[PDB]
Amino acid sequence: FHSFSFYELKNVTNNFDERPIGNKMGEGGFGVVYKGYVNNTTVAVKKLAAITTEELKQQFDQEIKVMAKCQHENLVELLGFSSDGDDLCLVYVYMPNGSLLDRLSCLDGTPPLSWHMRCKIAQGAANGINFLHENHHIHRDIKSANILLDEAFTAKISDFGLARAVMTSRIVGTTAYMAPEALRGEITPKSDIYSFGVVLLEIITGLPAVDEHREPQLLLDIAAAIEDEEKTIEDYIDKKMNDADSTSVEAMYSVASQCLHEKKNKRPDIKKVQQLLQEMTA
Numbered sequence: 001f002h003s004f005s006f007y008e009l010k011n012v013t014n015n016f017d018e019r020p021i022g023n024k025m026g027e028g029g030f031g032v033v034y035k036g037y038v039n040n041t042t043v044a045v046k047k048l049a050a051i052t053t054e055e056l057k058q059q060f061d062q063e064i065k066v067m068a069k070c071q072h073e074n075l076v077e078l079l080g081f082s083s084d085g086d087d088l089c090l091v092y093v094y095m096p097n098g099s100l101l102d103r104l105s106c107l108d109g110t111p112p113l114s115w116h117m118r119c120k121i122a123q124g125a126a127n128g129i130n131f132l133h134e135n136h137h138i139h140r141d142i143k144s145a146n147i148l149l150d151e152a153f154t155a156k157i158s159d160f161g162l163a164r165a166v167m168t169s170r171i172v173g174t175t176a177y178m179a180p181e182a183l184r185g186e187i188t189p190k191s192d193i194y195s196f197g198v199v200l201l202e203i204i205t206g207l208p209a210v211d212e213h214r215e216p217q218l219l220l221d222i223a224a225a226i227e228d229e230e231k232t233i234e235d236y237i238d239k240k241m242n243d244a245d246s247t248s249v250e251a252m253y254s255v256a257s258q259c260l261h262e263k264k265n266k267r268p269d270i271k272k273v274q275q276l277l278q279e280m281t282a
């Protein structure tokens with residue numbers, strides 16, 4: 001962890017080249033992600049930008065304060081920052097296999113993830129969330145776009161800008177993933193569990209949480225329909241796998257179903273989610 005010149009980051013990203021492969025790797029609510037090389041190391045550079053006011057500086061310090069000295073197997077690693085130039089920048093260890101969202105959608109012609117790799121990714125993500133909840137942190141934006149994958153497809157939770165240590169007026173997050181109480185402005189770790197429930201649906205189905213062109217448009221409505229015997233999980237299992245067995249899929253769905261209880265107090269805690277995912281692969 002150290003301070004970077006805005007001009008070093010500007011330089012190694014080809015003046016923040018917004019063309020894909022180019023240097024642009026992705027885009028979120030709070031900025032663009034660029035590929036760069038500093039200190040003999042390939043890095044991800046998030047240039048923060050707005051909705052969000054000067055609150056983007058508050059998410060900048062929030063993430064630095066939370067991640068500056070954090071090391072977990074299943075959390076992304078912050079290498080440093082830049083605040084000496086035009087825009088706020090965060091520099092991370094490069095995740096060569098990008099986001100779970102992008103790998104589930106097979107963006108850029110990447111091969112589909114096997115059920116084996118999907119099970120390991122779910123366990124890792126839950127281990128990442130468990131670490132945060134143990135340290136009395138709430139993520140507030142758990143989704144497939146915020147689960148990154150390293151050179152061994154190890155799951156790394158990312159984007160701690162909205163993380164906290166309760167009601168609020170400023171309601172923020174991705175609505176396709178957000179628990180009902182989180183939409184009303186509640187801040188609780190139980191909201192993170194609900195969101196993880198949706199990530200598990202993405203993993204089982206390979207479908208995005210929201211699709212404008214889909215009936216139904218929200219993936220958590222497909223879950224509701226399965227529970228009302230209007231559909232079966234078997235009909236929605238991702239066709240792009242050869243190694244998926246009914247038992248382990250149905251076991252993961254069971255975890256996702258428990259996570260997606262609309263009443264927060266009925267949902268399992270992260271420790272219970274971890275255990276049920278372990279018994280899935282045993």
Ligand SMILES: COc1cc2nn(CC(=O)N3CCOCC3)cc2cc1NC(=O)c1cccc([C@@H](O)C(F)(F)F)n1
Pocket residue numbers: 025026027028033043044045046076077092093094095096097098099102108110148158159
């Ligand atoms: C959304 O971000 C990324 C997208 C990417 N795409 N790729 C290419 C890729 O995945 N391919 C597969 C192999 O074949 C070529 C295509 C690597 C990517 C890496 C990305 N992110 C990070 O490395 C990273 C690390 C730490 C923290 C963060 C986030 O907090 C941030 F900053 F992005 F918001 N991101």
